Write a protein that binds this ligand. Structure first.
Ligand SMILES: Cc1cc2nc3c(=O)[nH]c(=O)nc-3n(C[C@H](O)[C@H](O)[C@H](O)COP(=O)(O)O)c2cc1C
Ligand SMILES: Cc1cc2nc3c(=O)[nH]c(=O)nc-3n(C[C@H](O)[C@H](O)[C@H](O)COP(=O)(O)O)c2cc1C
Lengths: 149, 148
């Protein structure tokens, strides 16, 4: 593409992480843009989820420690980064490393939020698998020693 | 309008490295890097703009993914490969690279979008799983092994 605006759009559309912009409206942060990676990550098309609060990705799983941290940071206008349990349209659980950055528009006096979403399910599963295997090694060490004593 | 500023903020607060390159002869030279790419590689943008990204390989050129990337760029198709890369201070990291060629038929120039992710932590975890699976299998075999 030609100008730098077209290149900025290409960069956002080809990002592997989800990228969204929300706008403060009362008690919700309303989605006003989602990129293709977010549609693929969540299983929803943009027309289905634009102009909603993204909390719907939690389903009924609302009492998560990272949720209170996000709330406090948004309240204070500070960036944050937390891993949450979210659910795709098909219902499957995935682990979402969410990065939120508040940005204040000095022209219109309005606050926007940049959100970056990364599916870290595979890394979460791998680390759980390491811990399970380490526990199995510990049991094999106990068993070699119960055979030595 | 205000959407161009938002596009810019989206790219600048991305956690992955994001770059644009342009075809120039037989190589692809950087014309834009975002802040995460500078933090990821350890280089300031001004020191590496208008260079080909292959400098991140150092002298570590015997990697199969390099030829795969080269051929994909040669054919104008996207690709994705994990390479060993080196920061300015020399430290190794595993770089998962997503490259998308985009041809501008009006100005007859080819651009490339590149996404860079440090996957060092995930590579080490998957290796750790394979090593532990082998350890568990050998320890169980030793418990089963004949005593003759
Ligand atoms: C830009 C942005 C992106 C967000 N993305 C997600 C998301 O992908 N998944 C999720 O569960 N919550 C996401 N949230 C959080 C919810 O929108 C909401 O802030 C959170 O659940 C805490 O507020 P609440 O207690 O009113 O629900 C995002 C918030 C913002 C501002
Ligand atoms: C947009 C773009 C981004 C790239 N980013 C990297 C990178 O971060 N690390 C790397 O080792 N190679 C990267 N490359 C690949 C090298 O630039 C080069 O294409 C590759 O080494 C194969 O070409 P060569 O055989 O001439 O070295 C990138 C290529 C493009 C087009």
């Amino acid at each position: 593409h030609m100008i730098n605006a077209k290149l900025l759009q290409l960069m956002v559309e080809h990002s592997n992480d989800g990228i969204v912009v929300a706008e403060q409206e009362g008690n919700e942060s309303i989605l006003i843009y989602v990129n293709p990676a977010f549609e693929r990550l969540t299983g929803y098309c943009a027309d289905d989820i634009l102009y909603q609060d993204c909390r719907f990705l939690q389903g009924e799983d609302h009492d998560q420690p990272g949720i209170a941290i996000i709330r406090e940071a948004i309240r204070e206008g500070r960036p944050c980064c937390q891993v949450l349990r979210n659910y795709r349209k098909d219902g499957s659980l995935f682990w979402n490393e969410l990065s939120i950055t508040p940005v204040h528009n000095e022209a219109d006096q309005l606050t926007y939020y940049i959100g970056i979403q990364r599916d870290v399910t595979a890394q979460v599963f791998a680390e759980e698998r390491v811990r399970e295997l380490e526990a199995e090694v510990a049991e094999l060490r106990r068993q070699q020693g119960q055979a030595k004593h």
